[PDB]
């Protein structure tokens, strides 16, 4: 894709922190991205119209390669078009802003360049107020093996490059990608049924995914997933799995991974409404990436998370799941919770932590999102699912919320004005960003 020219491009700036010790951290001025895969796609020559609604142009894009030529990727009136602001070390997404619903962003080292974070042996934390997200909505704070770059040096057809938000992937390998790899997506697009503004292509865009943080004020979860090679990689049809696709289990990535929701492990009192982390209020989120024999070069062996709220320190609470033990991601907790719920063991089958660590040592991308869920509404997150199921057979009940819950055109008619606000981000060694 080209770099458009109809609305300028700048991004928004937010502070975060690198910490060396305990109380001792400096000050990092970073900015924002919003994804290509939000923006007004426009021919470089008329300001037309590449995309319109969910069908391309077919002068401009007669196949993926013209139309990469052809198209541009605009800039973004980040606060009035999206319902993006930030103002310090805080980002806040809204929901809903004219015909436009949510956001992706990328934080960047440079205005070309995303931040990278090796993972290993260290430890990310955040706060964040969800306290406005509903059933139906994530708020999501997650890390992706995605190139620093964008794509721009493998691709000359991406001439948009980071600056534009380019070169995302995930573990679902996401097919709704409208550039991918410096080619556009319109060889076999075919316009979503239910969403009208959304399709799916022919290639789609793998990558191993750490889910730090999907969650809305019911509940949250904290979900590696690998893919069997690490960094970005496109694939085609079918054979991609993921969400989109066919067969979700046909392709290179785990698409479930190897989750730790609270509630779904078996204690409903922790985290909610005036629970023991209180989603009324805001709170500190702190995850830690633990290797085998504490080094920066040993491989990944448990993920732990910390929550602080009212400056109380407090450990995610052990799973209450008969065959599943503790309150962290290790491989022995995640070959027993899938054996517990009886789902597939797609975690192990794509190389486990031990992958996962593997595109940690090739660098992460930081995203901080806000979505909803046309493919299951959530239901995965916050409800009990499948719906068909008895919510009292381990695995199934996620949150409260009913099964008719988060249907994309229910939430967003009534709750447009949900938002989710990330903040005072800190980055460091083991025990460098909370009093441990
Ligand atoms: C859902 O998860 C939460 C979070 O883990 C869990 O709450 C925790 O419950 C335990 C048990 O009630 C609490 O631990 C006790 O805390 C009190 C007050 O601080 C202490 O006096 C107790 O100390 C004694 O017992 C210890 C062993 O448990 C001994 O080591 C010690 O020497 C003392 O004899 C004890 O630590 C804990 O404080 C809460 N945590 C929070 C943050 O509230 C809850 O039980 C889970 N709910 C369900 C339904 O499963
Ligand atoms: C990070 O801090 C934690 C908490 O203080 C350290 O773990 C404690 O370590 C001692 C052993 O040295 C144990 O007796 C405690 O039970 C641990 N507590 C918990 C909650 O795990 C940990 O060692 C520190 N990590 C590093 C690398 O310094």
């Given at each position: 894709?080209?770099?458009?020219?109809?609305?300028?491009?700048?991004?928004?700036?937010?502070?975060?922190?690198?910490?060396?010790?305990?109380?001792?951290?400096?000050?990092?001025?970073?900015?924002?991205?919003?994804?290509?895969?939000?923006?007004?796609?426009?021919?470089?020559?008329?300001?037309?119209?590449?995309?319109?609604?969910?069908?391309?142009?077919?002068?401009?894009?007669?196949?993926?390669?013209?139309?990469?030529?052809?198209?541009?990727?605009?800039?973004?009136?980040?606060?009035?078009?999206?319902?993006?602001?930030?103002?310090?070390?805080?980002?806040?997404?809204?929901?809903?802003?004219?015909?436009?619903?949510?956001?992706?962003?990328?934080?960047?080292?440079?205005?070309?360049?995303?931040?990278?974070?090796?993972?290993?042996?260290?430890?990310?934390?955040?706060?964040?107020?969800?306290?406005?997200?509903?059933?139906?909505?994530?708020?999501?704070?997650?890390?992706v093996a995605?190139?620093?770059?964008?794509?721009?040096?493998?691709?000359?057809?991406?001439?948009?490059?980071?600056?534009?938000?380019?070169?995302?992937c995930d573990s679902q390998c996401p097919r709704?990608?409208?550039?991918i790899?410096?080619?556009?997506?319109?060889?076999?697009?075919?316009?979503?049924?239910?969403?009208?503004?959304?399709?799916?292509?022919?290639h789609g865009s793998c990558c191993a995914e750490?889910?730090?943080?999907?969650?809305?004020?019911?509940?949250?979860?904290?979900?590696?997933h690998?893919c069997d090679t690490p960094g970005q990689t496109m694939c085609?049809?079918?054979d991609c799995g993921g969400?989109?696709?066919?067969?979700?289990?046909?392709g290179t990535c785990?698409p479930?991974?190897?989750?730790?929701?609270?509630?779904?492990?078996?204690?409903?009192?922790?985290?909610?409404?005036?629970?023991?982390?209180?989603?009324?209020?805001?709170?500190?989120?702190?995850?830690?990436?633990?290797?085998?024999?504490?080094?920066?070069?040993?491989?990944?062996?448990?993920?732990?998370?910390?929550?602080?709220?009212?400056?109380?320190?407090?450990?995610?609470?052990?799973?209450?799941?008969?065959?599943?033990?503790?309150?962290?991601?290790?491989?022995?907790?995640?070959?027993?919770?899938?054996?517990?719920?009886?789902?597939?063991?797609?975690?192990?089958?794509h190389?486990?932590?031990?992958?996962?660590?593997?595109?940690?040592?090739?660098?992460?991308?930081?995203?901080?999102?806000?979505?909803?869920?046309?493919?299951?509404?959530?239901?995965?997150?916050?409800?009990?699912?499948?719906?068909?199921?008895?919510?009292?057979?381990?695995?199934?009940?996620?949150?409260?919320?009913?099964?008719?819950?988060?249907?994309?055109?229910?939430?967003?008619?009534?709750?447009?004005?949900?938002?989710?606000?990330?903040?005072?981000?800190?980055?460091?060694?083991?025990?460098?960003?909370?009093?441990?």
């Amino acid at each position: 894709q080209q770099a458009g020219t109809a609305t300028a491009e700048n991004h928004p700036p937010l502070t975060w922190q690198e910490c060396t010790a305990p109380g001792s951290c400096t000050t990092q001025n970073g900015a924002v991205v919003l994804d290509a895969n939000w923006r007004w796609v426009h021919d470089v020559n008329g300001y037309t119209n590449c995309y319109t609604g969910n069908t391309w142009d077919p002068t401009y894009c007669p196949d993926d390669e013209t139309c990469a030529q052809n198209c541009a990727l605009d800039g973004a009136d980040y606060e009035g078009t999206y319902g993006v602001t930030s103002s310090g070390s805080s980002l806040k997404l809204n929901f809903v802003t004219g015909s436009n619903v949510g956001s992706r962003l990328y934080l960047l080292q440079d205005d070309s360049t995303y931040q990278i974070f090796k993972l290993l042996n260290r430890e990310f934390s955040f706060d964040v107020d969800v306290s406005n997200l509903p059933c139906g909505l994530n708020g999501a704070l997650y890390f992706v093996a995605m190139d620093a770059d964008g794509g721009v040096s493998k691709y000359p057809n991406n001439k948009a490059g980071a600056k534009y938000g380019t070169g995302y992937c995930d573990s679902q390998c996401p097919r709704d990608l409208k550039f991918i790899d410096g080619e556009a997506n319109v060889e076999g697009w075919q316009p979503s049924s239910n969403n009208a503004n959304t399709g799916i292509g022919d290639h789609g865009s793998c990558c191993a995914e750490m889910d730090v943080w999907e969650a809305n004020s019911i509940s949250n979860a904290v979900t590696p997933h690998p893919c069997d090679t690490p960094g970005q990689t496109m694939c085609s049809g079918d054979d991609c799995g993921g969400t989109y696709s066919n067969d979700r289990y046909a392709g290179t990535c785990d698409p479930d991974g190897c989750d730790f929701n609270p509630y779904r492990m078996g204690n409903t009192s922790f985290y909610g409404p005036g629970k023991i982390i209180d989603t009324t209020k805001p709170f500190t989120v702190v995850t830690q990436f633990l290797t085998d024999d504490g080094t920066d070069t040993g491989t990944l062996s448990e993920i732990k998370r910390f929550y602080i709220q009212n400056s109380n320190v407090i450990p995610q609470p052990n799973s209450d799941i008969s065959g599943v033990t503790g309150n962290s991601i290790t491989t022995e907790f995640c070959t027993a919770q899938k054996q517990a719920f009886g789902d597939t063991d797609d975690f192990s089958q794509h190389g486990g932590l031990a992958k996962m660590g593997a595109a940690m040592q090739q660098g992460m991308v930081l995203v901080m999102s806000l979505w909803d869920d046309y493919a299951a509404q959530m239901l995965w997150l916050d409800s009990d699912y499948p719906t068909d199921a008895d919510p009292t057979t381990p695995g199934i009940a996620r949150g409260t919320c009913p099964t008719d819950s988060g249907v994309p055109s229910d939430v967003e008619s009534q709750s447009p004005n949900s938002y989710v606000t990330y903040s005072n981000i800190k980055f460091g060694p083991i025990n460098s960003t909370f009093t441990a």
